[PDB]
Design an enzyme around this catalytic site. Structure first.
Site, PDB file in Angstrom:
ATOM      1  N   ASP A  47       0.811  -1.207   0.000  1.00 46.59           N
ATOM      2  CA  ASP A  47       0.000   0.000   0.000  1.00 46.59           C
ATOM      3  C   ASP A  47       0.852   1.268   0.000  1.00 46.59           C
ATOM      4  OD1 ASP A  47      -2.307  -1.490  -0.137  1.00 46.59           O
ATOM      5  OD2 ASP A  47      -3.064  -0.885   1.848  1.00 46.59           O
ATOM      6  N   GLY A  93      15.513  -3.569   5.255  1.00 46.07           N
ATOM      7  CA  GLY A  93      16.479  -4.323   4.498  1.00 46.07           C
ATOM      8  C   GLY A  93      17.595  -4.873   5.362  1.00 46.07           C
ATOM      9  N   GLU A 134       6.493  -1.161  11.400  1.00 45.69           N
ATOM     10  CA  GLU A 134       7.836  -1.346  10.873  1.00 45.69           C
ATOM     11  C   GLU A 134       8.339  -2.673  11.406  1.00 45.69           C
ATOM     12  OE1 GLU A 134       9.362   1.301   8.958  1.00 45.69           O
ATOM     13  OE2 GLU A 134      11.212   0.193   8.505  1.00 45.69           O
TER      14      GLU A 134
END
Ligand SMILES: [Ca+2]
Ligand SMILES: [Ca+2]
Ligand SMILES: [Ca+2]
Ligand SMILES: [Ca+2]
Ligand SMILES: [Ca+2]
Ligand SMILES: [Ca+2]
Ligand SMILES: [Ca+2]
Ligand SMILES: [Ca+2]
Ligand SMILES: [Ca+2]
Ligand SMILES: [Cl-]
Ligand SMILES: [Cl-]
Ligand SMILES: [Cl-]
Ligand SMILES: [Cl-]
Ligand SMILES: [Cl-]
Ligand SMILES: [Cl-]
Ligand SMILES: [Cl-]
Ligand SMILES: [Cl-]
Ligand SMILES: [Cl-]
Lengths: 271, 271, 271
Positions: free
Chosen positions: B142, B167, B190
């Site tokens: 999204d 990452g 997150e």
């Protein structure tokens, strides 16, 4: 070449109700353009540290604000990405020579506005850097981060994903948001309204700091505002109400480290 | 067609101080390019699940890192959207045939880098997908979400607005961040640093997970780290200090559901 | 010019399994296009306030959903910014005349979809506005904010950086997310799932509101859901479990102000 640039800007500010994109003199347009050029190149900066205190140059903020008043909106772009704005982007018309000279990387679709300084060895992941910002050497601006207007970002700073550094153009007298050298700002954190994060500090994910955010020092039990002392490790927490019915979120300093520790411990390992 | 691709990559890694965009051999350039091509197509992946444990392929990470070393930055784009970077975007030069073959949608201004795999029936709202990521079938990414380097996103995952999946390229040995099949990740959450969210889990808005985030299981009263067990419903909360002066934010598992429940209950209804 | 547009849309909805981008009649395509045109111009809106209650027009949502079904994906853009989607962007083909007529600013790389209404004196910083949204006069949409599908944003609203206003297309009967006039929504906040923020309210940074978020009124000690009463000042907090072992995050109303106070006190000064 104005006789005194600051004075020309200050008198144009006083005359600003009579300035528009149609009526403005060459003298004032050139003075404003020269100031923005200086910001873009880093020869001028909205705030700088002198005698170990950050100082603001109100006349430079006035120039930035006049640059909005003196330009009309213009169509920019093409195809499914048409825009309409009055502030040029920083890299318009750049070729290889100009980018190589700058020494930084701009990962698509990152954008910066003209009048923001980007130092050598900066990496702009997809992100935004607004006019008046200063982003010093070696700093990483990660994906969907924002460096707001006039913000001062130090050397070797890591702005993680989704981090926002709030702009401060008005009030004229207000210092901008400051992230000092070698800070780590964890993902989704926000530092706004001229909060100063001093050098070597580490903000965890989800730390939100404004001038009204309580900063609770766990070791001392004391509450302060507006400034993260150098080397602080800051995480989200809360303080209870007197009657115990609820708590209000705040920032918590859970330890403080020196520069040697930051070089010999990874951010991951600092917690 | 290298005799052994892994060995060529590993010996190039050992020789990396002597590799640059000018001096690199055709043999090494082809081995790196072939590895990135394989990542882009999903024939290779940085991590995969074997015997019910996620395994990392360090040689593939080495190839990704070499691909940075072997390319110069280049001007990209035009008009008010000029960029300067050394990683090609995924869809450069695609036409209708290539997009139709891929089976996914790319909503402007979404960008992905070459070397990220995007499966059929994925929708990329404006978002970023970095090199090495794997985004499996039916997943929704999204607006202003981020899928970071090497992250593994399962099938039928919903990454809500502003979600970041962190990452993990270095350290080479570290597993990437993993979101398993059918997870819902609520807005602004997150998940970073190789945290594993196991299948069928539901993260509410504002959940931030790193390796150091305490995960408090409300039913058992126990604290764990680094992994959300399958089917967990996770919301933001906090744990009090021993003396009651303050609390530190954490994640709280408030219930656990099975796959049947996820099919017969909406995300909205799961709380 | 349909004899009754609503009825045509409703009968097309009933027939939707038999509609595709190849087989759809001119009658239905024109009815859908006319509805989207009306949304784009603000002559139609998905929800509106009548007799002091927000009402939803389900037939308009049906038209939006049919517009997806009736169009194929198409290649959009060029260079390092190629896309592939079935919803046109709002400003495609606009020139100076069209942008001047609209009266708003679109800062690159902001994008809006066709079928979103943007009023005069709006500023879209880099941000996204999805189909069906209504953004009324004088509103500021700051960097990496999102106005989701069908959301209704009032006049003189400030959506700060990274704010997300969640979309609500399905269920058809559900009211969209509503931000009423003169609200301030602080950075990184999220308001989703048809929560209503009534006029003159102020959300601090990091407030996340869904239908299941507890809203604790500090003055009264009461918990409610789904609606921020007019003039409320809302900050993140938490409520403790009965046994004191942990807390769960919630929103806390810490005071309530009238319209006079909002005009004579800055947002910064309201806390
Ligand atoms: Ca003049
Ligand atoms: Ca420009
Ligand atoms: Ca040049
Ligand atoms: Ca070689
Ligand atoms: Ca490219
Ligand atoms: Ca093609
Ligand atoms: Ca028909
Ligand atoms: Ca278009
Ligand atoms: Ca025109
Ligand atoms: Cl200028
Ligand atoms: Cl200072
Ligand atoms: Cl309180
Ligand atoms: Cl390559
Ligand atoms: Cl595992
Ligand atoms: Cl503690
Ligand atoms: Cl249409
Ligand atoms: Cl209502
Ligand atoms: Cl509880």
């Amino acid at each position: 070449h104005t006789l005194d640039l600051q004075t020309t800007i200050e008198q144009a500010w006083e005359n600003r109700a009579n300035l528009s994109p149609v009526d403005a003199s060459a003298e004032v347009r050139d003075a404003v353009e020269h100031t923005i050029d200086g910001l873009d190149l880093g020869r001028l900066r909205v705030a700088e540290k002198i005698d170990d205190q950050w100082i603001v140059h109100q006349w430079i903020k006035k120039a930035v604000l006049l640059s909005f008043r003196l330009h009309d909106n213009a169509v920019m772009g093409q195809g499914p990405l048409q825009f309409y704005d009055k502030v040029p982007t920083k890299f318009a018309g750049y070729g290889e020579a100009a980018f190589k000279a700058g020494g930084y990387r701009v990962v698509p679709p990152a954008v910066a506005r003209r009048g923001a300084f980007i130092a050598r060895n900066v990496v702009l992941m997809p992100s935004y850097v607004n006019i008046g910002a200063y982003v010093d050497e070696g700093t990483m601006v990660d994906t969907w981060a924002t460096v707001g207007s006039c913000a001062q970002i130090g050397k070797n700073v890591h702005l993680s994903g989704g981090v926002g550094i709030g702009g401060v153009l008005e009030p004229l007298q207000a210092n901008p948001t400051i992230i000092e050298d070698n800070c780590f700002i964890g993902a989704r954190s926000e530092v706004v309204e001229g909060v100063v994060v001093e050098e070597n500090s580490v903000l965890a994910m989800g730390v939100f700091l404004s001038q009204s955010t309580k900063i609770y020092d766990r070791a001392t039990g004391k509450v302060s505002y507006g400034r993260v002392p150098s080397g602080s490790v800051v995480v989200p927490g809360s303080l209870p109400s007197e009657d115990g019915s609820h708590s209000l979120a705040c920032a918590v300093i859970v330890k403080r480290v020196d520069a040697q520790t930051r070089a010999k411990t990874s951010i991951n390992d600092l917690l």
